[PDB]
Coordinates of C-alpha atoms and ligand atoms in Angstrom, one line a residue:
Chain A
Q4 CA -236.1 26.0 208.7
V5 CA -236.9 29.6 207.5
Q6 CA -235.4 33.0 208.1
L7 CA -237.9 35.8 208.6
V8 CA -236.0 39.2 208.4
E9 CA -237.8 42.5 209.1
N10 CA -236.4 45.8 207.8
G11 CA -237.4 49.5 207.4
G12 CA -237.8 50.5 211.1
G13 CA -236.8 53.9 212.4
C14 CA -237.7 57.2 214.3
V15 CA -240.1 59.6 212.5
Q16 CA -242.0 62.8 213.5
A17 CA -245.6 61.8 214.2
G18 CA -247.7 62.1 211.0
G19 CA -244.8 60.6 209.0
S20 CA -244.6 57.2 207.4
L21 CA -242.4 54.1 207.3
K22 CA -242.5 51.0 205.0
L23 CA -241.6 47.8 206.9
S24 CA -240.5 44.5 205.0
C25 CA -240.4 40.8 205.8
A26 CA -238.1 38.5 203.6
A27 CA -238.8 34.8 204.3
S28 CA -235.7 32.8 203.0
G29 CA -235.7 29.0 202.6
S30 CA -237.3 26.1 200.6
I31 CA -240.7 27.9 200.8
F32 CA -243.6 26.6 198.6
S33 CA -246.5 28.7 200.1
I34 CA -247.5 30.5 203.4
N35 CA -251.1 30.3 204.7
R36 CA -250.9 33.9 206.0
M37 CA -248.2 36.4 207.1
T38 CA -249.3 38.6 210.1
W39 CA -247.6 41.8 211.3
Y40 CA -247.5 42.2 215.1
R41 CA -246.4 45.0 217.5
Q42 CA -245.1 44.6 221.1
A43 CA -244.3 47.8 223.1
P44 CA -242.0 47.4 226.2
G45 CA -244.0 45.4 228.8
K46 CA -247.3 45.6 226.9
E47 CA -249.4 42.8 225.3
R48 CA -248.6 41.9 221.7
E49 CA -251.2 43.5 219.2
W50 CA -252.3 42.0 215.9
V51 CA -251.8 44.7 213.2
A52 CA -252.4 43.2 209.8
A53 CA -252.6 39.9 207.9
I54 CA -252.3 38.8 204.2
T55 CA -253.2 35.2 203.0
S56 CA -252.3 33.5 199.7
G57 CA -254.6 35.2 197.2
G58 CA -254.0 38.6 198.8
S59 CA -257.0 38.4 201.3
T60 CA -256.2 41.3 203.8
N61 CA -257.4 41.8 207.4
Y62 CA -256.3 44.9 209.6
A63 CA -256.7 46.1 213.3
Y64 CA -259.1 49.0 213.8
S65 CA -256.3 51.1 215.5
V66 CA -254.6 51.2 212.1
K67 CA -257.2 50.6 209.3
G68 CA -256.9 53.3 206.6
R69 CA -253.3 54.3 207.7
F70 CA -251.6 50.8 207.2
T71 CA -251.5 48.9 203.9
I72 CA -250.1 45.3 203.7
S73 CA -248.6 44.2 200.3
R74 CA -246.8 41.1 199.1
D75 CA -244.1 40.5 196.3
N76 CA -244.9 36.7 196.5
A77 CA -242.2 36.3 193.9
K78 CA -239.7 37.6 196.5
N79 CA -241.8 35.9 199.3
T80 CA -241.4 39.4 200.9
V81 CA -244.5 41.2 202.6
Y82 CA -244.6 44.9 203.3
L83 CA -246.5 47.2 205.8
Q84 CA -246.9 50.8 204.4
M85 CA -247.5 52.8 207.7
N86 CA -248.8 56.3 206.9
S87 CA -249.9 58.9 209.6
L88 CA -247.7 57.4 212.4
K89 CA -248.8 58.2 216.0
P90 CA -246.6 58.0 219.1
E91 CA -249.0 55.2 220.2
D92 CA -247.8 53.2 217.2
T93 CA -244.2 53.0 218.8
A94 CA -243.3 49.3 219.3
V95 CA -241.3 46.4 218.0
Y96 CA -243.0 45.3 214.7
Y97 CA -242.5 41.6 213.7
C98 CA -244.1 39.1 211.2
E99 CA -245.3 35.5 211.8
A100 CA -245.5 33.2 208.7
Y101 CA -248.5 31.0 209.6
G102 CA -248.9 27.7 207.7
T103 CA -245.4 27.7 206.1
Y104 CA -244.8 24.8 203.7
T105 CA -241.2 24.0 202.9
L106 CA -240.3 21.0 200.6
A107 CA -237.1 19.5 199.1
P108 CA -236.9 18.2 195.5
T109 CA -236.5 14.8 197.4
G110 CA -240.1 15.0 198.9
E111 CA -238.9 15.7 202.5
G112 CA -240.8 18.9 203.7
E113 CA -241.9 20.8 206.8
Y114 CA -245.3 22.6 207.6
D115 CA -244.5 25.0 210.6
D116 CA -245.1 28.6 211.8
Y117 CA -242.0 31.0 211.8
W118 CA -241.5 34.3 213.8
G119 CA -239.2 37.3 212.9
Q120 CA -236.6 39.0 215.3
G121 CA -238.4 42.3 214.9
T122 CA -237.7 45.9 213.8
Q123 CA -238.1 49.0 216.0
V124 CA -240.7 51.7 215.1
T125 CA -240.5 54.9 217.3
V126 CA -242.7 58.0 216.8
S127 CA -241.7 61.3 218.6
Chain B
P4 CA -230.0 2.1 216.9
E5 CA -231.5 2.3 213.4
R6 CA -230.8 -1.6 213.1
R7 CA -234.0 -2.3 215.3
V8 CA -235.9 -0.6 212.3
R9 CA -234.0 -2.7 209.6
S10 CA -234.2 -5.7 212.0
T11 CA -238.1 -5.5 212.4
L12 CA -238.5 -4.6 208.7
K13 CA -236.8 -7.9 207.8
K14 CA -237.6 -10.2 210.9
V15 CA -241.4 -9.3 210.8
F16 CA -242.3 -7.9 207.3
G17 CA -239.6 -9.9 205.4
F18 CA -238.0 -7.1 203.3
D19 CA -234.2 -6.4 203.7
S20 CA -234.4 -2.7 202.8
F21 CA -237.2 -0.1 202.3
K22 CA -239.0 0.3 198.9
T23 CA -237.7 3.9 198.4
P24 CA -235.4 6.3 200.3
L25 CA -238.4 8.5 201.2
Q26 CA -240.3 5.5 202.7
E27 CA -237.2 5.0 204.9
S28 CA -237.3 8.7 206.0
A29 CA -241.0 8.7 206.5
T30 CA -241.0 5.4 208.7
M31 CA -237.9 6.6 210.5
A32 CA -239.4 10.0 211.5
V33 CA -242.6 8.1 212.6
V34 CA -240.3 6.0 214.8
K35 CA -238.9 9.1 216.6
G36 CA -242.4 10.3 217.3
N37 CA -241.1 13.9 218.1
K38 CA -243.2 15.4 215.2
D39 CA -246.7 14.7 213.6
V40 CA -246.3 13.4 210.1
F41 CA -247.9 13.5 206.6
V42 CA -247.1 10.7 204.0
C43 CA -248.2 11.3 200.4
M44 CA -247.0 8.4 198.1
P45 CA -248.9 6.8 195.2
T46 CA -250.8 3.6 196.1
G47 CA -248.2 0.8 196.7
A48 CA -245.1 3.0 197.4
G49 CA -245.4 1.3 200.8
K50 CA -247.4 3.8 202.9
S51 CA -248.8 1.1 205.3
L52 CA -245.3 0.2 206.5
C53 CA -244.6 3.9 207.5
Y54 CA -247.0 3.2 210.5
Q55 CA -247.5 -0.6 210.5
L56 CA -243.7 -1.0 211.5
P57 CA -243.3 1.8 214.1
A58 CA -246.7 0.5 215.7
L59 CA -244.8 -2.7 216.7
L60 CA -241.7 -0.8 218.0
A61 CA -243.9 1.5 220.2
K62 CA -244.7 1.0 223.9
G63 CA -248.5 1.0 223.6
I64 CA -251.3 0.6 220.9
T65 CA -251.5 2.2 217.4
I66 CA -255.0 3.2 216.2
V67 CA -255.7 3.4 212.5
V68 CA -258.8 5.2 211.1
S69 CA -259.5 3.9 207.5
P70 CA -262.6 5.1 205.8
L71 CA -264.0 1.8 204.4
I72 CA -264.3 -1.7 205.9
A73 CA -263.1 -3.1 202.5
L74 CA -259.7 -1.4 203.0
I75 CA -259.4 -2.5 206.6
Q76 CA -259.9 -6.3 205.9
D77 CA -257.1 -6.4 203.2
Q78 CA -254.5 -5.2 205.8
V79 CA -255.9 -7.2 208.9
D80 CA -255.5 -10.4 206.8
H81 CA -251.9 -9.5 205.8
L82 CA -250.9 -8.3 209.3
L83 CA -252.4 -11.6 210.7
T84 CA -250.0 -13.6 208.5
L85 CA -247.2 -11.6 210.0
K86 CA -248.4 -13.0 213.3
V87 CA -249.2 -9.4 214.5
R88 CA -252.3 -9.3 216.9
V89 CA -254.2 -6.6 214.9
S90 CA -257.9 -6.1 215.8
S91 CA -260.7 -4.3 213.8
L92 CA -263.7 -2.6 215.4
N93 CA -266.2 -1.7 212.6
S94 CA -269.9 -1.6 211.4
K95 CA -269.5 -5.3 210.0
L96 CA -268.3 -6.9 213.4
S97 CA -270.4 -9.5 215.2
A98 CA -272.5 -8.7 218.4
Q99 CA -270.5 -11.2 220.5
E100 CA -267.1 -10.4 218.8
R101 CA -267.7 -6.6 219.3
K102 CA -268.2 -7.1 223.2
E103 CA -265.3 -9.8 223.3
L104 CA -262.8 -7.3 221.7
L105 CA -264.1 -4.4 223.9
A106 CA -263.2 -6.7 226.9
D107 CA -259.7 -7.3 225.4
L108 CA -259.1 -3.5 225.1
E109 CA -259.9 -3.1 228.8
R110 CA -257.2 -5.6 230.0
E111 CA -253.8 -4.5 231.3
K112 CA -251.5 -5.6 228.4
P113 CA -254.3 -5.9 225.7
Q114 CA -253.7 -8.6 223.0
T115 CA -254.2 -5.8 220.4
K116 CA -251.2 -3.8 219.2
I117 CA -252.8 -2.2 216.1
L118 CA -256.5 -1.2 216.1
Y119 CA -258.2 -0.6 212.6
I120 CA -261.5 1.4 212.9
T121 CA -264.1 3.2 210.7
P122 CA -264.4 7.0 211.2
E123 CA -268.2 6.2 211.8
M124 CA -267.1 3.9 214.7
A125 CA -264.6 6.5 216.1
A126 CA -267.4 9.2 216.6
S127 CA -270.1 6.8 217.8
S128 CA -270.7 7.7 221.5
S129 CA -271.2 3.9 222.2
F130 CA -267.4 3.6 221.7
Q131 CA -266.1 6.7 223.6
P132 CA -265.9 4.8 226.9
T133 CA -263.3 2.3 225.5
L134 CA -261.4 5.3 223.9
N135 CA -261.3 7.3 227.3
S136 CA -259.9 4.4 229.4
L137 CA -257.1 3.9 226.7
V138 CA -256.5 7.7 226.5
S139 CA -256.4 7.7 230.4
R140 CA -253.8 4.9 230.9
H141 CA -252.0 6.8 228.0
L142 CA -252.1 3.5 226.0
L143 CA -251.9 5.3 222.6
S144 CA -248.4 5.5 221.1
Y145 CA -249.8 6.5 217.6
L146 CA -252.9 7.8 216.0
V147 CA -253.0 7.1 212.3
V148 CA -255.4 8.6 209.8
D149 CA -255.4 6.7 206.5
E150 CA -257.0 8.3 203.4
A151 CA -256.5 11.7 205.1
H152 CA -257.9 13.4 201.9
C153 CA -261.5 12.5 203.1
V154 CA -261.2 15.5 205.5
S155 CA -261.1 18.0 202.5
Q156 CA -264.1 19.1 200.4
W157 CA -261.5 19.9 197.6
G158 CA -260.7 16.1 197.8
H159 CA -262.4 13.7 195.4
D160 CA -264.0 11.7 198.3
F161 CA -264.9 14.1 201.3
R162 CA -266.3 12.1 204.3
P163 CA -267.9 14.3 207.0
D164 CA -267.0 11.5 209.5
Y165 CA -263.3 12.7 209.1
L166 CA -264.0 16.2 210.4
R167 CA -264.5 14.9 213.9
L168 CA -261.1 13.1 213.8
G169 CA -259.2 16.4 214.3
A170 CA -260.9 17.1 217.7
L171 CA -260.0 13.6 218.8
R172 CA -256.3 14.1 217.8
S173 CA -256.1 17.1 220.2
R174 CA -257.6 15.0 223.1
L175 CA -254.7 12.5 222.4
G176 CA -252.0 15.2 223.1
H177 CA -249.6 12.4 224.3
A178 CA -249.1 10.7 221.0
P179 CA -247.9 11.8 217.5
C180 CA -250.4 11.6 214.6
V181 CA -249.5 10.1 211.1
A182 CA -251.7 11.1 208.2
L183 CA -251.5 9.4 204.8
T184 CA -253.0 9.6 201.3
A185 CA -251.9 9.1 197.7
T186 CA -253.9 12.2 196.4
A187 CA -253.4 15.8 197.7
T188 CA -253.2 19.2 196.0
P189 CA -251.6 21.8 198.4
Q190 CA -255.2 23.0 199.1
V191 CA -256.0 19.4 200.2
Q192 CA -252.8 19.3 202.3
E193 CA -253.5 22.5 204.2
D194 CA -257.1 21.1 204.6
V195 CA -255.5 17.9 206.1
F196 CA -253.2 19.8 208.6
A197 CA -255.9 22.3 209.7
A198 CA -258.9 19.9 210.1
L199 CA -256.8 17.2 211.9
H200 CA -255.2 19.8 214.3
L201 CA -251.7 18.2 213.6
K202 CA -248.9 19.7 215.8
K203 CA -246.3 21.8 213.9
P204 CA -243.7 21.0 212.8
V205 CA -245.3 18.4 210.6
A206 CA -242.6 16.4 208.7
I207 CA -244.0 15.7 205.2
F208 CA -242.9 12.8 203.0
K209 CA -244.4 13.5 199.6
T210 CA -243.3 11.4 196.5
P211 CA -242.6 14.1 193.9
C212 CA -244.2 14.0 190.4
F213 CA -241.0 15.0 188.5
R214 CA -239.2 12.2 186.5
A215 CA -235.7 13.1 185.1
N216 CA -235.9 11.1 181.8
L217 CA -239.3 12.5 180.5
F218 CA -239.3 15.5 178.0
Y219 CA -242.7 17.3 178.1
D220 CA -243.6 19.7 175.3
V221 CA -246.9 21.1 173.9
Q222 CA -247.7 21.6 170.2
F223 CA -250.7 23.7 169.1
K224 CA -252.7 21.6 166.5
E225 CA -253.9 24.9 165.0
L226 CA -250.3 25.9 164.0
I227 CA -249.6 22.6 162.1
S228 CA -250.9 22.2 158.5
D229 CA -250.1 18.4 158.6
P230 CA -251.0 17.4 162.1
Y231 CA -251.4 13.6 161.5
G232 CA -248.0 13.7 159.8
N233 CA -246.5 15.8 162.7
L234 CA -247.7 13.0 165.1
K235 CA -246.2 10.3 162.8
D236 CA -242.8 12.2 162.6
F237 CA -243.0 12.5 166.5
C238 CA -243.8 8.8 167.1
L239 CA -240.8 7.8 164.9
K240 CA -238.2 10.2 166.5
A241 CA -239.3 8.6 169.8
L242 CA -239.2 4.9 168.7
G243 CA -236.2 5.5 166.4
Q244 CA -233.6 6.3 169.2
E245 CA -231.7 3.0 168.4
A246 CA -230.6 3.5 164.8
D247 CA -229.2 -0.1 164.6
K248 CA -232.2 -1.7 166.3
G249 CA -234.7 0.3 164.1
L250 CA -237.9 0.7 166.1
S251 CA -237.0 0.1 169.7
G252 CA -239.9 -0.1 172.1
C253 CA -243.5 1.2 171.7
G254 CA -245.7 4.3 172.6
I255 CA -249.3 5.4 173.4
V256 CA -251.5 8.0 171.8
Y257 CA -254.5 9.0 174.1
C258 CA -257.8 10.3 172.5
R259 CA -261.2 11.3 174.1
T260 CA -263.7 9.8 171.6
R261 CA -263.7 6.0 170.6
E262 CA -264.2 7.4 167.0
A263 CA -261.0 9.4 167.1
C264 CA -259.0 6.4 168.4
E265 CA -260.2 4.1 165.5
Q266 CA -259.7 7.0 162.9
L267 CA -256.3 8.3 164.2
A268 CA -254.7 4.7 164.5
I269 CA -255.6 4.4 160.8
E270 CA -254.3 7.9 159.8
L271 CA -251.0 7.1 161.6
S272 CA -250.7 3.5 160.1
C273 CA -251.2 4.8 156.5
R274 CA -248.8 7.7 157.1
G275 CA -246.0 5.2 158.3
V276 CA -246.5 4.1 161.9
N277 CA -248.3 0.8 162.5
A278 CA -251.0 1.6 165.2
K279 CA -254.1 -0.2 166.6
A280 CA -257.2 1.4 168.3
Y281 CA -257.9 0.4 171.9
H282 CA -261.2 1.2 173.8
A283 CA -264.0 -0.3 175.9
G284 CA -266.2 -0.2 172.8
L285 CA -264.3 -3.2 171.3
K286 CA -265.0 -7.0 171.9
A287 CA -263.1 -8.3 175.1
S288 CA -261.2 -10.6 172.7
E289 CA -260.2 -7.9 170.1
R290 CA -258.9 -5.8 173.1
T291 CA -256.7 -8.6 174.6
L292 CA -255.6 -9.0 170.9
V293 CA -254.6 -5.3 170.5
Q294 CA -252.9 -5.3 174.0
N295 CA -250.9 -8.4 173.2
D296 CA -249.9 -7.1 169.8
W297 CA -248.8 -3.8 171.4
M298 CA -247.3 -5.7 174.4
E299 CA -245.0 -8.0 172.2
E300 CA -244.2 -4.8 170.0
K301 CA -245.8 -6.6 166.9
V302 CA -247.7 -3.3 166.7
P303 CA -245.6 -0.6 168.5
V304 CA -248.2 2.2 168.8
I305 CA -251.6 2.0 170.5
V306 CA -254.3 4.8 170.2
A307 CA -256.6 4.6 173.2
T308 CA -259.0 6.3 175.7
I309 CA -258.4 6.3 179.4
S310 CA -259.4 2.6 179.3
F311 CA -255.8 1.7 178.5
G312 CA -252.8 1.9 180.9
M313 CA -254.6 0.3 183.9
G314 CA -251.9 -2.0 185.2
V315 CA -250.2 -2.4 181.8
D316 CA -246.6 -2.6 183.2
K317 CA -244.9 -2.2 179.8
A318 CA -241.5 -0.6 180.7
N319 CA -240.1 0.7 177.2
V320 CA -243.0 3.2 176.5
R321 CA -240.9 5.8 174.6
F322 CA -243.7 8.3 173.9
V323 CA -247.2 9.3 175.3
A324 CA -248.9 11.7 173.0
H325 CA -252.3 13.2 174.0
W326 CA -254.2 13.9 170.7
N327 CA -257.0 15.6 172.8
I328 CA -256.3 17.5 176.0
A329 CA -257.1 15.4 179.2
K330 CA -260.1 16.1 181.6
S331 CA -257.7 17.0 184.5
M332 CA -253.9 17.7 185.2
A333 CA -254.4 14.6 187.5
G334 CA -255.3 12.5 184.4
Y335 CA -252.5 14.0 182.2
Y336 CA -249.8 13.2 184.8
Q337 CA -251.1 9.6 185.1
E338 CA -251.6 9.1 181.3
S339 CA -248.2 10.8 180.2
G340 CA -246.3 9.0 183.1
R341 CA -246.9 5.6 181.5
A342 CA -244.0 6.7 179.4
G343 CA -240.3 5.9 180.2
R344 CA -241.0 3.4 183.2
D345 CA -237.8 1.6 182.3
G346 CA -236.0 5.0 182.8
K347 CA -234.6 5.2 179.2
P348 CA -235.3 8.8 177.9
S349 CA -238.9 9.2 176.7
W350 CA -241.2 11.9 175.3
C351 CA -244.6 13.1 176.6
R352 CA -246.4 15.6 174.3
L353 CA -249.9 17.2 174.4
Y354 CA -251.7 18.3 171.2
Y355 CA -253.6 21.5 172.3
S356 CA -256.4 23.1 170.2
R357 CA -258.7 25.8 171.7
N358 CA -261.3 23.8 169.7
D359 CA -260.5 20.7 171.9
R360 CA -260.4 22.8 175.1
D361 CA -263.8 24.3 174.4
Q362 CA -265.4 20.8 173.7
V363 CA -264.0 19.4 177.0
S364 CA -264.7 22.6 179.2
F365 CA -268.3 22.4 177.8
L366 CA -268.5 18.6 178.6
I367 CA -267.3 19.0 182.2
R368 CA -269.8 21.9 182.9
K369 CA -272.6 19.5 181.5
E370 CA -271.4 16.4 183.4
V371 CA -271.1 18.7 186.6
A372 CA -274.4 20.6 186.4
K373 CA -275.9 17.1 185.5
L374 CA -274.4 15.9 188.9
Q375 CA -275.8 19.0 190.8
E376 CA -279.4 18.1 189.6
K377 CA -279.1 14.4 190.6
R378 CA -277.1 14.6 194.0
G379 CA -277.4 18.4 194.6
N380 CA -274.5 20.9 195.1
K381 CA -270.8 19.9 196.0
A382 CA -267.4 21.7 196.5
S383 CA -265.4 18.9 194.8
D384 CA -267.3 20.1 191.6
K385 CA -265.0 23.2 191.7
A386 CA -261.8 21.1 192.1
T387 CA -263.2 19.1 189.1
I388 CA -263.3 22.3 187.1
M389 CA -260.1 23.9 188.4
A390 CA -258.3 20.5 187.8
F391 CA -259.0 20.9 184.0
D392 CA -258.2 24.7 184.1
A393 CA -254.8 23.9 185.6
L394 CA -253.9 21.8 182.4
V395 CA -255.2 24.5 180.0
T396 CA -253.0 26.9 181.9
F397 CA -250.1 24.4 181.3
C398 CA -250.6 24.7 177.6
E399 CA -251.6 28.5 177.3
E400 CA -248.6 29.6 179.6
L401 CA -244.9 30.0 178.9
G402 CA -242.8 28.3 181.6
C403 CA -241.1 24.9 182.6
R404 CA -243.6 22.0 182.1
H405 CA -242.2 19.9 185.1
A406 CA -242.5 23.1 187.3
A407 CA -246.1 23.7 186.1
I408 CA -247.0 20.1 187.1
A409 CA -244.9 20.4 190.3
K410 CA -246.8 23.6 191.3
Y411 CA -250.2 21.9 190.8
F412 CA -249.4 18.8 192.9
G413 CA -247.4 20.7 195.6
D414 CA -243.9 19.3 194.6
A415 CA -240.7 21.5 195.0
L416 CA -239.2 23.2 191.9
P417 CA -238.0 20.2 190.0
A418 CA -234.5 19.7 188.6
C419 CA -235.6 19.9 184.9
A420 CA -232.5 20.2 182.8
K421 CA -233.6 21.1 179.1
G422 CA -236.2 18.4 179.9
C423 CA -239.2 20.5 178.6
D424 CA -239.8 22.6 175.4
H425 CA -239.8 25.9 177.5
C426 CA -236.5 25.3 179.5
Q427 CA -234.9 24.0 176.2
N428 CA -236.1 26.9 173.9
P429 CA -238.0 29.5 175.9
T430 CA -238.1 32.0 172.9
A431 CA -239.5 29.4 170.4
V432 CA -242.3 28.5 172.8
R433 CA -243.0 32.2 173.1
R434 CA -242.9 32.4 169.3
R435 CA -245.4 29.5 169.1
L436 CA -247.8 31.1 171.7
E437 CA -247.7 34.6 170.1
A438 CA -248.8 32.6 167.0
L439 CA -251.8 30.9 168.6
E440 CA -253.2 34.4 169.4
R441 CA -253.4 35.2 165.7
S442 CA -255.5 32.0 164.9
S443 CA -258.6 33.6 166.6
Ligands
ZN1 ZN1 -238.3 22.3 182.1

């Protein structure tokens, strides 16, 4: 199994920026896609942004042109640069590693999806 | 508990233990049935068992989609000897037999335990009735897709038939699915998981490519003023690894052209190392002669096209040198891997010239565009190309050779310990690449 760990959450004055991160630890070969999600208290989960292997990006309209999703694939660590933060952006931001291929040198290996705990973003 | 596994393996199939530790794990995780499963082992690492055996130990029936009738027959015959009531519904089946089996499949306690079936058959609406009544009574313990690689267009043998199988798997929510092939790049694997709708986690049992005892390196023909002599020197270091026994064992040199084989075998002989040319151009007799000479180590070095190595089974092959780069990383792993079968340390080496690469790259684009004019367009034409590019990368890049091969095939970082030029001398391989720049 695989640890997804988010980091870089906080409170900011609206108009500010944050940079969220997602370290996937484990015997990871490749990940089909890593998707950033936000869930506000008692509100439906919202798809924010996605990056596939080969850096093919995909962003929600609510955020297009404020949010930028990067990947240090060497560190298997994806980022969300969040510029021009609005109070409506306040939520728990978490990644999903979709199509995550672990393998052992032995040939035993697991293809599964994996979900982070989250990090809180709050905008005054 | 695990004894019923060992017990049936022995009592039915008549082996005491499994062929490899991975076959055990694969078969054992098919037994539990709590996960869907992918098995990727070369032909004859015992993939059939990984489902044939659990099929018997399961409550209900085990249905096996195999793409060709040819493949089905081979197994039915063998399973029938094991006194297993295995049935096959296919194109080839007789009008009366077809209706007689259909009747069997409808009975409470059907005689069939293991049903082999064409993907053609599986989609055909004339069959769906039988399928439903079986799905209904939840009489499926296991669905098995053999030759899973036929679902992918990046596979060498895409069968559209196989695309419909994924929808069927979802209808069979009850049962775990087992998918098997020999051949799968990571792109073919994800294609296999996606298009079959397998339920995560998928446990994957994938025979890695990495072999401890093989030392891969690359030399750049363009940097070597005496190449024929460099090859000679190489062949002897490899054969000469028992000082007292003199020349211990044998090796192979692979060439593209039949010409180059004939020519090179001579250049090697004259320069010290007795060598004979092998290729389909020669008389059947002259070949069996050269094989036998090579086989009994009368002539320890054989210079050959991709003709040679097909079921050789010579253990002490101390070197495989590629004079010309190979048409695919697929081909290079197969060719080079005829080395060191006995597990005594061996050397695989690739003679790279840009001049070679250009010839081949040209010849693939011709043979490919020639294919597109005859049979029209295909997506496996790109795998064909990218398969060559992967091997050029292997030569033109700094970095562990075993890793490079592991990357391409989807194997985990391999335990290479000074087992390739790069890991042994990263700087000198940089020095040698920096140099190839200046040539051109
Ligand atoms: Zn290495």
